[PDB]
Structures are given as structure tokens and as C-alpha cells.
Amino acid sequence: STECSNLLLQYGSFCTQLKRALTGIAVEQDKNTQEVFAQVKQIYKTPPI
Amino acid sequence: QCVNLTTRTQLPPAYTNSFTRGVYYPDKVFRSSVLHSTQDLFLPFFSNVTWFHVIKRFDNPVLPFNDGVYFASIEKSNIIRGWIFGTTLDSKTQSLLIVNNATNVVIKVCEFQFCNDPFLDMESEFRVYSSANNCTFEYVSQPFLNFKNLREFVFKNIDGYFKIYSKHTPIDLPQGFSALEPLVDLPIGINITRFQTLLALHRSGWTAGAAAYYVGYLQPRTFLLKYNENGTITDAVDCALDPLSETKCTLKSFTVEKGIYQTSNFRVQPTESIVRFPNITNLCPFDEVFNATRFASVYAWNRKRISNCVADYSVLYNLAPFFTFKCYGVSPTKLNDLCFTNVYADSFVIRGDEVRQIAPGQTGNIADYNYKLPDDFTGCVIAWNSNKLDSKVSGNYNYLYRLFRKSNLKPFERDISTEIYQAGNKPCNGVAGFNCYFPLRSYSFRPTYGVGHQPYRVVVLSFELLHAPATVCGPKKSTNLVKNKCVNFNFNGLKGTGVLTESNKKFLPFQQFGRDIADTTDAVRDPQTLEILDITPCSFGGVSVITPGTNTSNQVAVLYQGVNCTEVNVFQTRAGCLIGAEYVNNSYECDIPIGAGICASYQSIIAY
Amino acid sequence: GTGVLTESNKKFLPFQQFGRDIADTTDAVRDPQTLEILDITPCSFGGVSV
Amino acid sequence: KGLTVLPPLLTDEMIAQYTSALLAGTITSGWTFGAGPA
Amino acid sequence: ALGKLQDVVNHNAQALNTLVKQLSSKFGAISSVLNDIFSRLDPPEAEVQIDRLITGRLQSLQTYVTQQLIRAAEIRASANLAATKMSECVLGQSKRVD
Amino acid sequence: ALGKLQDVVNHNAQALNTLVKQLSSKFGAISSVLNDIFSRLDPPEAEVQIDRLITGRLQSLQTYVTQQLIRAAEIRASANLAATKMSECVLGQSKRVD
Amino acid sequence: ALGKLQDVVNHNAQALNTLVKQLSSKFGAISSVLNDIFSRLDPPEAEVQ
Ligand SMILES: *[C@@H]1O[C@H](CO)[C@@H](O[C@@H]2O[C@H](CO)[C@@H](O)[C@H](O)[C@H]2NC(C)=O)[C@H](O)[C@H]1NC(C)=O
Ligand SMILES: *[C@@H]1O[C@H](CO)[C@@H](O)[C@H](O)[C@H]1NC(C)=O
Ligand SMILES: *[C@@H]1O[C@H](CO)[C@@H](O)[C@H](O)[C@H]1NC(C)=O
Ligand SMILES: *[C@@H]1O[C@H](CO)[C@@H](O)[C@H](O)[C@H]1NC(C)=O
Ligand SMILES: *[C@@H]1O[C@H](CO)[C@@H](O)[C@H](O)[C@H]1NC(C)=O
Ligand SMILES: *[C@@H]1O[C@H](CO)[C@@H](O)[C@H](O)[C@H]1NC(C)=O
Ligand SMILES: *[C@@H]1O[C@H](CO)[C@@H](O)[C@H](O)[C@H]1NC(C)=O
Ligand SMILES: *[C@@H]1O[C@H](CO)[C@@H](O)[C@H](O)[C@H]1NC(C)=O
Ligand SMILES: *[C@@H]1O[C@H](CO)[C@@H](O)[C@H](O)[C@H]1NC(C)=O
């Protein structure tokens, strides 16, 4: 509904707040994975034997 | 007086770039050192603005006003003097005239008989209009006015208010920024759809002085305005021009740091509206219910089923004899646009003061013991005076009401039982006597009584909303069905925007439409053809603008999240389709994270 | 409204009547009789802790 | 209906590659790789 | 054995399913479908009904974001613990008991 | 280099700024200014309009307080970590890797 | 000495007490009691209250 979006614009920055909080969570998950697994800057490999 | 000019040289009108012009102050509010977002009628940045010249060139066409007009004038010696606004530009309608002659600025609202070629011509010759009959408004104001002058004007006609914004600049169009100050707020309250500018000739036939003007059209959009310490608008951002400015508008800043920013959601818009209604058309017998000579009494109110007809309710609203046409669960004006089933007309006659009691949730005598409406009632109550038909000078006693009953009735319940009532401790045993009264008493309808007691005929139309296959519909015509395209459809009063596709869902014969987990309709059975169409919402996704700092570069790339590249430097990622970045097989450290192992950087913008 | 009216250093343009601050609240007004600009600082607000 | 799941920045194979690098460091070098050169 | 990760997946999927399910709530309006509200009422009362739906759905969405932030804090604490274990148990030998 | 503190300052200032910006939201009323409601409408409808503004602003304020509580939990966890680093890295030598 | 546990008990009890006291809030309605709304108003407006 276009008219619902027009009426939704009257409520201000609620949508921006929710998107910003979700974006913060989304970048936080990637930061968590970097902190746990990306603790070495060298990719070591095992010997073939 | 009118004069035809037949010495023109044929040339098509030119087009050029608007750059960052056409900005005006949205309101009369001072703001200092802030960024403010406005959704107003604005001119887009770098838009296609029409260019006209006056040099033998004499450009005076008549252009549509649309929703707003930006007029730019690269002017010397003040050839351009005014404008004409209206709809038909004759005495049939009312027109607005803006002129600035050699002495003073005149604003008039009259029914001018305009010339086909109106123009101006020491200046002692005025041939603009031949007559002005009905003048409703006059306003006299201050003088508004190598090429030396840039005159920028914005005309808007919103809510019958005509706003003129103006700016003068000492100078194709120059590239720069200049905010237009509001000049005239005009209370006209008339329709304007077409305009024409007024030029001035030079006579020595005639010669045209060197001038150039530009016409642009306003569209509803949002701008991000920057206000300095002195309250003067110095910069603006068009939020819908390019993804970089969209990012600037979203972050509410003119400088964007390096990173990926979620800005908006791309969604494909519908192309055409398809209405599907049942093909069957039978004139609905509203004449039988509403024009009948005799109605039933309120205790024995008549219920008529209405089904398998197309109903035109517009003939009921436009007629003036009915005092009350009051609807509760549906709008009166939308009845022609909807489809219904479970339609019932309940006809009875009541008093003048009792018409308030034919409503949900009312406390009263006929509400409790004659006709009860449910709390969730949808439909319309119709009441009109029937003193001319349902009254007699000797007393019309044919209409009876249940004065006494042991308990209140249920909704849509009729009681016609002529049993005696026990009003006291003593049982009555079916015989009248002390504290034993008949429940049904007749109204003493006479024409001599005042309003409030005169007989009123009330018809209650009861409907149900969309929860069954509909048999009663409005006069809207059925359109053809289109497959695999985004359309805004109306199926039996159900409006939606989606793509209609073939389906493999084995609907049972009773089943008409289908509902998903969220309960929004996902499939529907089309009338006339009885086929089952699947409804899928139109393509949409999140737009992320990958950009480095604005200090470094203005190049951007866009990521359409969860969207394959064939439904929108093109690279397909698991995260979505990336436009504007070139995939490089080399591996670098992650600079701007895209997702699914893909990162972006600036070196052009590369993705790796 | 209710507020302290002080003389303003703001240079309102001729069309401009009232002014909004950083947060879009009415911080300046032009008097309808004498065309001068006045800031409207709100009356002092404090948190009373015991 | 407006809900989307964004993919993680590190895919499963790259996370597995990081675990492989950590395993190779802790097997071939002990704790030396965590405090400096392996 | 793998209940913790499956539990996290279940909470995220269940929160999304609940958020989708909340669209089927009238929220004190005549219908849960916005298009019906437009197709049935005049703008003075349709505006009120659309408002009822918008405030209900917005409350649902803010509730979902609030539990997402609380779960994000819990998962961030668990990830900080996992990073500490990776640094101290995998990249070194720990004298910390248990 | 100092992004973490700058982020804390930016999130607190941005939350405060958004909270004041929410006062300029009509929330589905005729105006965002209470005085306009008193001057433009009779009390039977004025009570409804002020009720709408009060519920919208109260919901905004509750959202802000909830965000502050979640951020306070995050900062408390970071401060507990900082106190642990102050005790174990500054006031002693730590055998804990990284 | 035992302030931290007493604080936890106080916050839980105070939160419960506040949740109880919120039932005596009209929230804009004519009364905080549902029965009074059913008896004092018609169902079209009682539903709203
Ligand atoms: C200038 O030219 C225009 C266009 O040819 C003339 O307008 C027409 O005049 C004829 C006169 O018989 C009318 O029948 C038409 O209806 C007019 N057309 C329109 C669109 O108005 C105009 O009259 C000419 N000017 C003069 C002074 O003759
Ligand atoms: C402007 O419009 C003309 C035709 O109306 C077109 O030929 C021209 O390419 C357009 N200019 C731009 C920049 O799109
Ligand atoms: C204004 O006039 C145009 C045609 O000149 C017409 O299509 C439009 O409906 C009119 N608008 C109003 C509001 O009268
Ligand atoms: C300019 O127009 C006004 C309004 O018709 C008129 O009174 C005035 O005399 C005009 N000026 C000249 C020089 O004719
Ligand atoms: C407009 O003018 C015509 C002729 O001059 C006249 O008959 C008509 O009554 C006028 N209408 C109005 C509304 O002034
Ligand atoms: C603002 O005005 C002051 C004087 O009123 C002037 O010195 C200053 O340069 C102006 N700033 C801008 C950006 O115009
Ligand atoms: C309504 O009824 C009157 C007589 O009762 C009749 O003359 C008239 O034609 C009827 N009109 C319609 C539309 O049926
Ligand atoms: C009209 O609709 C009916 C079902 O309502 C269907 O049986 C019939 O075939 C349709 N006729 C046409 C010409 O579409
Ligand atoms: C009256 O008001 C005008 C502007 O509205 C102003 O210029 C003038 O000084 C005022 N006169 C007095 C006596 O206040």
C-alpha cells in the first residue's frame, strides 16, 4: 500500500531505528566470527607427511 | 486587440541539464546550521529542462503546468514581463495574469479572453487580452525585476494556494547553487493546468531582444537541505537522483565515510490495474425493497435475501428524499467497488425518534424486544419519513411493536409469538386483566404530529466481508487477466499488488482463495473462468550502497540483496547482485564487507 | 508557549517569521508589531535530587 | 514480507580454512605461532 | 550433543516465524488486511483502523528487535568467551582450572 | 585508532538526537504541537489527539530506555573486561595468551 | 555486606510490584476496571476502552 507508507511517514524515524539496530547486530555477528576464528594472519598448512 | 505573428522561424525546442538549480525554501521557518529533509514538489537535480531562445526566434508556446513549474531566465534588458495561468485561457474558465509593465507589478484573476499570440510591446502598446468580464481578485506589488541577470522562479498550486518563489543572481545555465526565496503567497483557489509566458517586442516590423528561458517540471520528492550559520541554504541533496545522494539522504550527512550502507528497498511497481468481477449481470431488485407500498411491522420485520445480482448503490446516494443513509462497517461511497454475499434487506416502520435505536449497541425498546443488531454488524441503515404513505388522518394502526417481553432478543431474531406477558406476581394464564397486557401495541400515526413521532421507513442492509464466495457485486467492469507481470489487482473487493501465475495447488470445489502463515491471500480463484491463480508479491530487495569516503571519490556500487542478476560491471554473489563493481580474481584484505566471502575496495571500485 | 524572551542575534530573512533550532523546536520568533527577532529560551528546568 | 537473511561475511569453507590454519599452527608449532612467528 | 547451536537456530527461526505470524493479528481493528480497510472505509475512519494495524505491527517489530538485541548480547558474550578459549586453550596452554 | 570510544559517543549522541527528533512526529495526529491541538479542537477530540501524542512519545521514550539498557549491559561487560585487564595486565603479569 | 543479593531481590520484587500497580492505570480510559466499562458504556465504545 502506497497510502499506508504515506501514513507511516508520519511516525518519524522508527523504521530507521529498527534498520540501524538490525544492521548493528548484523555487523556484530561478522565481528564475532572474526574475533573467534580470525586470530592468525598467516594461513598455516600441515606437511604432506 | 490581437495580432498574429507570421514571421517566426521553425525550430524545435532545445533541452539541457538542470544541474543543481530549482531549489527553494520549503517553508517560512528559519533554520540555522542544520540538515533538514523535506518531501515537497521539487525539481530533480541534473534533469532534462526545456530550453527556449528569443533572438528571428520568438518562442511563446503554451505549456502544461503539471504539479509545479521551475522557470529560469537568462535575461538582459527585461524582455520577459509576466505569465498567464489557467485551464482553457478563455472566458469559459477563470484565469490568473501576472504582469510587470514599465511602472508597477499587477496580479489579476479574471475571465480574460486571451489572444492566440499574446505579447507586450517607450512602451505604449498593450495587446494581451481582448476582454475581462468577471474579476474576483486584484493585487498590486513591488517591482520583482553579455547576459547579466539570472532570474529563477518556482510556481506551485497546492490546496488552492499559488506560491511564487524567486531569486535574482548577477551573472547555457551556470553550474552553481542558489536557493530561491519565497516571494508571493497567493490565495486564488482556482484550477491551473496550463501556462504561457509573456514576452516584449522591440519596434523600430518588430525585433526580438536577446533572451533565453528554461522550463522545468516539479515532482514530489525529498531533498536534504543544508542551512548555514546565517540561515541561508547553501547545499542540497536529491535523495532519488543517484545512490551516493541516496546514502547522503539516509545518513543525514553530506559526507559519507567508507563502508556499505543500507539505503532503501528496490521494488518493481505495477504496470496496469486489472479488475476481475463475475461476468453475470442482473439488475438487482432494490426497487422491490425500497419502493414498496407496504412495509412490515417492527416486531415482524421483513427479511429479503439478495443474491446473484449486480447492485448500483450510486442511485441510492444521489437521490435526496432519504433523511438517513448511515453505514457502520463499510463506507457509503465504496459500495460500488465491492463484492458481497450474505446480503439481507430488513424492512420495517418505526417512529421518528427511534431511528437512533436501529444501531449496534443501543439501549431501547425496539432494540431489545423487536430488532437487535450485533456488535460486529456491517452494513447500512436507511431511514426516511413516510408520513405521506404510512399515515392516515383517522390513525394508521397497522404497524405494531412489542412493548413487553420477558427477555431481550438475539441479533437477527424475529419474534412473532402472540402470547400474553406476565407483568406482575400473579400469573395471567393467557387472559388479560390486572398487570396482564398484550405485548403488541399499535402506533397512532397521524399526519398532524411534529417530527420525531412521524412514521419512518427503515431498511437495514446486512453484508458479510470477503469471508465467502460473493454473489452481489458493484458495477465495476471486469478486465482481462495477465500472467507473470506485476499488477495491482482487484478480485471481488480484494486489492493487492503482485504477479499472477499458474498454480499447482489442488483447490477443493468449495475453496476459493488461499492464505499463508501471515494470513495474507496467496492464491485466488478468478471469477468467469474459475481458474486458480497463484499470487506472488512483486520482486523486491534491499539496496546497499558500497562507497569509499566522499573525500576520496564519488563512485558507488549497489548491492541488491537476495536478488539474482537477471531480475534487475555486473557480478552475481550469494549476497545478491552487485552493480558497478568489477570482480577481480586477486585476493586482498577485506575493506568494505559485502558478504558470502565477497568484499569491496577502491583502487574504480573492485569486488574480490 | 512559555519561555524567556531575549533579543536575538539571528538575521531572519524577510519571509521568515519563526525559527527552529537543531531539533526543530521553535527557538526564535518575530514580533508581529515591531519587526524584531527574539530568542525563546525555555524556562529553567532542573532535576531535583534530595 | 520484508524478512531477509543476510549471508555471513565468512563462509563455511573460509571458517573451515581458518580452523585448518589454527590446527596446523598448533600441531606444527605448538603455542609459538600465537605469540609471534611460528 | 549439539543442542546449543541448534537452539540458537531454533530461536532465530522461531522469532522470524512469530514475526510473520503477528501480521495475522487484527490489533483491535476490523480486519488484519490493510487493503480491505482502504477498500471498505472512508479516510477519517480508515485512517484510524490503519493506525491500529500500524501501531500493532510496529510494536511487534520493536519487540522483535529488542529480543534480537538481547540475544545479540548473549551471543556476543558467548563469542567473546569462545575467542578467549581460542586464544588461551588453542593458541597456548592454560593453567586455569576447567 | 580510537573508533570504539567514538562509536560509544556517537551512539549515545545519536540516540539522544533521535529521541528529540521523535518529538517532531505527528504519530497520526493533526499536529505534533500540543498547543495547536488545544487551539484548533474541542476537548472531546483534543483528549484523543493528546492521547495519541502521549502514547507515541511514551513508546519512543521506552524504546530509548531499552536501547540504553542494552548498551549499558554491553558497556558493563566491556568495563568488567577492562577491570580484569587492569588487575591482570597492569597490576600483574598474565600468562593468558592474547 | 550482602548488598548485591539484596539488590537482586529488591529489583525483582519492585518490578513485580510495579507490574501489579500498572493494573490500576486507566491508560486513557474512563476506568481501570473492565466491569465498569462493560456496565457504563455501550459495546461500540466499550470495545475501544
Ligand atoms: C491569430 O491566429 C489564431 C489561430 O489561427 C486565430 O484564432 C482563431 O480565429 C478564428 C477566426 O475565425 C476562430 O474561428 C478560431 O476558433 C480561432 N482559434 C483559436 C484556437 O482560438 C486568431 O483569431 C488570430 N488573430 C486574429 C486577430 O485574427
Ligand atoms: C531530453 O529530452 C530530449 C527529447 O525530449 C532527448 O532527445 C534528450 O536526450 C534528453 N536529454 C537527456 C540528458 O536525457
Ligand atoms: C483541472 O482541470 C483539468 C483539465 O483542465 C481537469 O482534468 C482536472 O480534473 C481539474 N481539477 C480540478 C481539481 O478541478
Ligand atoms: C501598467 O499596468 C497598470 C494596470 O493596468 C496600469 O494602471 C498602468 O498605467 C500601466 N503602466 C503604463 C505605463 O501604462
Ligand atoms: C461572468 O460573466 C458573464 C458575462 O459577463 C455573466 O453573465 C456571469 O453572470 C458572470 N459570472 C459570475 C460568477 O460573475
Ligand atoms: C554569515 O554572516 C556573517 C555576518 O552576518 C558573515 O561574516 C559570514 O561570512 C556569513 N557566513 C556565510 C557562510 O555566509
Ligand atoms: C415506484 O412506485 C410508484 C408507485 O408506487 C411508481 O409510480 C414508480 O414508477 C415506481 N418507481 C420505480 C423506479 O419503480
Ligand atoms: C461467468 O461466470 C460463471 C461463474 O460465476 C461461469 O460459470 C461462466 O462460464 C462465466 N461466463 C463467461 C462468459 O465468462
Ligand atoms: C503596526 O504594525 C506594522 C506591521 O504590521 C508595523 O510596521 C508598525 O510599526 C505597527 N505600528 C505600531 C504603532 O505598533
Residue numbers in the entry:
A (entry chain A): 746 to 794
B (entry chain C): 14 to 68, 77 to 142, 153 to 176, 185 to 210, 215 to 247, 257 to 620, 641 to 675, 691 to 695
C (entry chain B): 548 to 597
D (entry chain A): 856 to 893
E (entry chain A), F (entry chain C): 944 to 1041
G (entry chain B): 944 to 992
Authors' own words:
The spike protein comprises two domains: the S1 domain, which contains the receptor binding domain (RBD), and the S2 domain, which is responsible for membrane fusion. The RBD mediates attachment to human cells through the ACE2 receptor and is the primary target of neutralizing antibodies. The Omicron variant has 37 mutations in the spike protein relative to the initial Wuhan-Hu-1 strain, with 15 of them present in the RBD.
(B) Cryo-EM map of the Omicron spike protein at 2.79-Å resolution. The RBD in one of the protomers (protomer 1) is well-resolved and is in the “down” position, whereas the other two RBDs are less well-resolved because they are flexible relative to the rest of the spike protein polypeptide. Similarly, the amino terminal domain (NTD) is poorly resolved, reflecting the dynamic and flexible nature of this domain. The mutations in the Omicron variant spike protein are distributed both on the surface and the interior of the spike protein, including the NTD and RBD regions. The mutations in the RBD are predominantly distributed on one face of the domain, which spans regions that bind ACE2 as well as those that form epitopes for numerous neutralizing antibodies. (C) Cryo-EM structure of Omicron spike protein indicating the locations of modeled mutations on one protomer.
